[PDB]
Amino acid sequence: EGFGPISFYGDFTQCFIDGVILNLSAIFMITFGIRDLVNLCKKKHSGIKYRRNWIIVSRMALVLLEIAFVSLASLNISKEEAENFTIVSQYASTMLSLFVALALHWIETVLLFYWLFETFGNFAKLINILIRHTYEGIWYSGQTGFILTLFQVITCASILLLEALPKKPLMPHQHIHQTLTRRKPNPYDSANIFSRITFSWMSGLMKTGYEKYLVEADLYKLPRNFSSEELSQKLEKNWENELKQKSNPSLSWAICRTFGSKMLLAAFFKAIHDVLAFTQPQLLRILIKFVTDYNSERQDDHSSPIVRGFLIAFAMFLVGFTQTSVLHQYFLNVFNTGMYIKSALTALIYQKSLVLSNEASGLSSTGDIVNLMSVDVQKLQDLTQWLNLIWSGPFQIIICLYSLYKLLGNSMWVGVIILVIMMPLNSFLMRIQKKLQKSQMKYKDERTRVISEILNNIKSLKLYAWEKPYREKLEEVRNNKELKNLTKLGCYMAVTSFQFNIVPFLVSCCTFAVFVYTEDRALTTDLVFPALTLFNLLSFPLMIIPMVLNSFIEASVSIGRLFTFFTNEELQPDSVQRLPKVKNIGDVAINIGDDATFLWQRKPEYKVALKNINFQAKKGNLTCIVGKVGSGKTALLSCMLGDLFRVKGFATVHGSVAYVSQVPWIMNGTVKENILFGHRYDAEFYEKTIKACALTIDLAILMDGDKTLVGEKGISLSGGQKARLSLARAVYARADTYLLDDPLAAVDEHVARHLIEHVLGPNGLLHTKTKVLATNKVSALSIADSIALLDNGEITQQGTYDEITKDADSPLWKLAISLRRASDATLGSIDFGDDENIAKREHREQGKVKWNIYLEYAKACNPKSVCVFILFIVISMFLSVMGNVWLKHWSEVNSRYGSNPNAARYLAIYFALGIGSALATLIQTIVLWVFCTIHASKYLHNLMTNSVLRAPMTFFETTPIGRILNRFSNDIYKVDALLGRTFSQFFVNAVKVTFTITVICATTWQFIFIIIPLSVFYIYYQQYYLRTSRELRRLDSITRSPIYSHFQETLGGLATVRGYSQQKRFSHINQCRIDNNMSAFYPSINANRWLAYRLELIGSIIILGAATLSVFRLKQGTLTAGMVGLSLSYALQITQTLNWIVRMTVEVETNIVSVERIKEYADLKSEAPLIVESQGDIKFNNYSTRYRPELDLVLKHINIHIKPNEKVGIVGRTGAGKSSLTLALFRMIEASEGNIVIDNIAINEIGLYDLRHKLSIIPQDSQVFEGTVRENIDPINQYTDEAIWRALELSHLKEHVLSMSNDGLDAQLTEGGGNLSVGQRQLLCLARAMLVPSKILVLDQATAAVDVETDKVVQETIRTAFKDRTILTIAHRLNTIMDSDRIIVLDNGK
C-alpha cells in the first residue's frame, strides 16, 4: 500500500489526503481560534453591540453545521477498524467543526477558506473511494460509509455557498446611515475574500454603467487610505525620519519604507505565479508520455487508465485558476501602491511649492516645476508597475533554464547564446526608440507652440489676411513631421517583427534540430512541444530585461530633482508680525522699524538689498511710493507683504492684507468665481463695487453672463478687463490694509480718472482705512495724502504735499462701523465642472455602435490596402499553423521509425516555413503602415486645417481658444500612432484566436457545443466592459489636466495668494482635485482587473474542455499523442490573447471616437472669398447698413457718403458701436443688409480676400507673430528689403535694428512680442501699414497705449505720408478730433 502523494492511480492516496486535511484543520483551529476570537473579544468585549436581525438563514447554516458534525461523529465509529492514522484526521475534523459551531455564532473569511479546504478534502476523499470502486467492488469497495461521505460533501458545499453568498440584513433602521446621497459608499469596504478575488462588486458597477452613462453621482466614494491628508501625514513622518539622518537617498528610503510592505506582498505573489507557470509544461509532458504509453500498452495487449488523464486535466485547470488569482492579486497590489505614491507626492509637492521662497521661484522657471509635477510623479507611478519585475525576470529565467536543462540534457545551451547575443540588439533598438520618441515629442511641441502663437492673435491674422504663408509653413513643418513619423514607423515595425520572430522559431529551429540528434536520442514528441511552450514563455524576459532599465535610470534623475526641490531654500517665519486689527483711529496701522534693512539675499549676501530706511503709515490714509523702474518700489512693497528675508528692523502689520500686483492674476474658474474669491454672496455690495470700479458695459461686452469662462480655458480678455477685474476683486475683499501696484496702468486714462474719485478719494468706499497705491500719475500725486520719493532702494524724502511744496519742488515735481470686514466661504466640496460642457456635445447620440464611422475611415484609407493587410495577416497565421502541424507530423514520423530522421530535409522545410511567416508579418507591419496610416494623418490633418482656417469670427469669439488648441494638437497625435498600432494588434489577435479555435475544432468534432456558450459569455463581458471603460477613460482624461493647470495658475499668483492668506483654501482645493482624480481612476484599473480575471477564467475553462474532450476521445478510440500535444500547446496561448484583444478593442473605440470629434471640428463652412469677376479717385458710401450676429443688434439706419481725399475722425461715448464700424468697413461679417459702395461696386459681390488685401488696419493691438522681422512685416515677398528699410526709417525705429540685428536684417523675436516695449510694436504696426500701399486706413485706440511722443510721431506720419489716403481714426484725442475734416458721430444704436 503506497503512501506518497501520487499512487499507481493518479489520485491522492488515503494517507496524503488525511495529511493535508490534518494540516488544514490544524492551521485553521489554531490561527482562527487565537487571532479572530482574541481580536473580536478585545475590540467588542464579547459583542457589546447586539445589532443583528437573526434571520432564518443563519439558523439554517447553524443547523447544517450541526448535522454535518453529527454525521462526522457517526462516521468516526466505523472507520476506526483498521490500524492507520485516520483517527488523527477524525479527531482534528471533530475539533475544527466543534470550534466552527461557535465561531459562526460569534460573528453575528478564515472560516470561509477553512470551509473551502474542507470541501476540497472531502471531494478528494470521495474521488479516491470512487476510483477504488472502479478498481474493486461496486459501491462499498473501501468501506460502506461513502454513501454518507456524499452527504458530508454536499453539506460542505451547501454550507460554504450559503455562508459566502447571502448578506447580513439588519432590522432596526438600517436606512438611517445613508443621509449623504451624493455618492454611494463603495462596496469594497463590505466584501469577503471569496467575492474580492472574483470582483463581483465591479460586476454590479459594470451593470450600472451598462444601463446608464456614468457621471459624478454614479461613481463611488474612495475608501480610506486614499485621501490626501492621511497619505501626506504618513509621508511627512518619514520625511522627519529623513531629517534625522539627512542625505540624498533619504527621500527614496522614506518613500520605500512607508509603502514597502505592499511591494513585498506583490513580490511574494509574483514568485507564486512564476513557480506555478512552469508546472503546465511538466503536465503537458507527462500527459504526452501517458497517452503514448497507453497506446503502447493497448498495442502490447493486442499483441499478447483514463483516471490518470482525467485527473491530469483537472490538475491543469486548477493550475490555471490559481495562476489567474495570484497574478491578478499581484497586479492589484502594485497599482494600489502606485496610487498611494501619486496621491502622497502630488500633495507634498503642492505644499512645498506653496511655501516656496520667492528667490527660489526666481531661480526656477515655471516650466521646470510644472514639468516636474507632471512628468516625474507620473514617471514614478509608471515605474511602480515594473519595479518588482526587475527581480521577477532573473528568477523566471533561471528556473526556466533549469527546467530546460533537466528536460533536454546537458550542454545544450544554444538558446542561451542566442539570448545573450540578441540582448545588445534589443538595447540598441530601445535606444533608437527613445531617441525617435524624444525627437517626435519636440516636433509636436514646436508645432503646438506655433499654433498657439497664431491662435492667440488670429483676429489680426484674418484682418491682414496672411493665411497662405502660415499654412505653407505648417505644411513645410508637416513634411519633416511625416518623414520622422515614417522613420518611427519603420523602426517600430522592425522591432515588432524581430520580437515576433527571433525567440520561438529561431531558438527552437536551432536547439531541437541540432542537439536532439547530436545527443543520439529520438525526439518521440515529448521534447519539442514543452520546448516550444518554454520558449514562448521565455520570450517575455528578452524584452523585459532592457525595458525596465530605462525607467530605472530615469528614476535617479526624478528622485534627484525631487530631492533638490524639497531641500531648496524656504523662508523664515519671523520676516514680519501680522499683529491684531487696527485700534481706534489715530495710532498706527503699518510699521517698518527704525533703520530697517532687507534684501533678496540671505545665503550669499548678494548686492540686492536696501539699508537703513524706516516707514510709518497713519490709520486711514492714502500713501503713494513714487519712483522709476528699479526704484525699489516693488522691493518695498514685497517687504510690506513679508515676502523678503529681513536683516534688520521691526515689521508690524495690523489687520488683514489685500494686494494687487502690476501684473493681474486670474484663476481658471469663472468671473463669478474670481470676483467671489472664496466669500459668501452679498448682492448689494457686489453691485456697489461693480458699479464703482468696473462698469455694467464691462460685463455686457463678454457676450455671456457672469458665469463666463476666463481666457486661460475660455474666451480671451483684454488687459484693461484684467485690471478692472483685479481691482474689483480687491475692493470686494473688504480688508484693513490695502496695497495696489499701478492697477490703472493697463486701462484708459480718462477711465482712470473715474477710478480715483469713486473708490480711492475721501468719498471712496474704503476711505477710512490704510491704503498704499504706488503710481507715477499726477492726479494720484495731487489727491494722495502722503508721498514717498523712492529710488535705488533708498527713500529720499517723505511727507505731505504741503511739506513737499515748501522747499524746492525739483526732485519729484520737475521730473461708527469699519464696514464689518469681509466674510470667507465654508471650504466646500467641488465636483469636476468640465463634464457638463462636453456632455452637451455628447448628448446628440447615446447608441454610437454602428460602424458607419469605421467605414468612413476605411473610405478615407485605400480599401485595397486594407484587404491586402487582412490577407497578409491570414497568410502569416496560416504559415505558422502549417509549421506547427508539420512539426507534429515530423515528430510522429520520428516516433514511428526509431531514430531514422530526415533531419536536414525537415530542417530546411521548417526554416522556410518559419522565415516565410516572419517575412509575411514583416511586410504586413512595415509597408501597410506607410500606405494606410500616414495617408490618414496627412489627409485628416489637411481637411481639418482647411476647414478651421476659413472659420468665422462668430466661431472664434464663441469657442475657447484653449479648447480647440488642445484638441487640434493632442488628438491629431493620437490618431497618428495609437490607432495604427491598435488596429494591427486587434486584427492579429482576432486571427490568432480564430485559428486556435479552428485547430481545436479540428482535434475533435464536438467542440462547437462547448465553445458557443463561452463565446456568448465573452461577447457579453466585452460589451459591458466597453460601455463602462469608454466613459471611465473619458472621465479620467477630464480630471487630469485641471490639477496641472491649477498648479500653474497658483504658482503664477504666488505673491497675491500668499498676500491674501487664502493658503488653506488653495490647499483644500488641491486636495479635492487630486481626490476627484483618484476617484476617476480607481474604478478604471479595477475594471481592467475584473475583465482580465474573467477572461483568464474562460481561458482556463477552454484548457479543461480541450483536455477532458481529448481524454474522452482517447477512451472512445485511437488517439495520436502528437495531436493531443499540438492541441494543448495551441490551447495554452488563449489567456494573453483574449486579455489583450478586449483592451485593444476598447482602445480602437476610443481612438475612433476622438477621430469623429476632430472631424466634427472639421465640419465647418463659411463664405467663398475667391475672386469671381479698385482704389483712388473714387467715392465711398454706406446705405441702410446692418451687420451683427443674429442674437444682437448694433448697426441700423446708417446712410453716409465720403468723397476721396478727406480725413475722418470718429467720436463716440462708451458702448456706441465703435468697433462695429471698422468690422463693417472690412466686411468681416457676411451679414450685410444694405449696400456699401466703393469704386461704384458693391463690396459683398466680389469677396473678402482681395478687399482685405487692399486696405490698411491698425487693430488697437501690437502683438505680432514670432520669427524674422522681415517675415513679420512682409511675409509674402512683396518688394525687396530696401522698401521695408525705408518704411522703418520713416517710422523711426532705426535704434532697434541698429542695436540688435548685427548679423543683418534677420533679428529674431520672442513669441508674443514681450521682449520689446509696446510703443515699439506700435511703430512696427505703423511701418507695416505704411508699407501697405492701400489708401483706406483704419486707426483705433490712440489714447490708451501711448507715451505722447508716439502719438505725435504717428499723427505726423499719417499726415505727411498719406497725403490723400482716406483715413478713419477712432480715438478720444482732442487734437485729432479737431484736425479731422469731417467728424462722424457714433450714435448709441443708429
Numbering used by the authors: 17 to 124, 133 to 328, 341 to 851, 901 to 1258, 1268 to 1484
From the paper:
Yeast Cadmium Factor 1 (Ycf1) sequesters heavy metals and glutathione into the vacuole to counter cell stress. Ycf1 belongs to the ATP binding cassette C-subfamily (ABCC) of transporters, many of which are regulated by phosphorylation on intrinsically-disordered domains.
In this study, we have used cryo-EM to determine the 3.4 and 4.0 Å resolution structures of endogenously phosphorylated Saccharomyces cerevisiae Ycf1 in two inward-facing conformations: wide (IFwide) and narrow (IFnarrow). We designated the state in which the NBDs are further apart as IFwide and the state in which the NBDs are closer as IFnarrow. The R-domain encircles NBD1 in both IFwide and IFnarrow and is stabilized by extensive contacts along a basic groove of the NBD1 perimeter, intracellular loop 4, and the Lasso motif. The electrostatic interactions are supported by a substantial burying of hydrophobic surfaces at 3 sites (site 1: I621 - L802 - I902 - I904; site 2: F917 - I1123 - L1120; and site 3: L912 - I915 - I1154). These interactions are poised to provide a large thermodynamic driving force of R-domain binding and stabilize the R-domain/NBD1 interface, burying ~1550 Å2 and ~1283 Å2 of surface area along the entire R-domain in IFnarrow and IFwide, respectively (~546 Å2 (IFnarrow) and ~425 Å2 (IFwide) specifically between NBD1 and the R-domain). In contrast to the interaction sites themselves, the major structural consequences of the IFwide to IFnarrow transition are induced at the ATP-binding sites. These sites not only move closer in IFnarrow but also rotate to occlude the non-functional ATP-binding site in NBD1. Overall, these architectural changes resemble changes in substrate-bound and substrate-free states of the Ycf1 homolog MRP1. These movements support a model where R-domain phosphorylation helps stabilize NBD1 to recruit other domains into a conformation (IFnarrow) suitable for ATP binding and initiation of transport. The tighter assembly in IFnarrow compared to IFwide may reflect the end result of the transition initiated by R-domain phosphorylation that leave key components of the transport cycle (ie NBDs, X-loop, GRD motif) engaged.
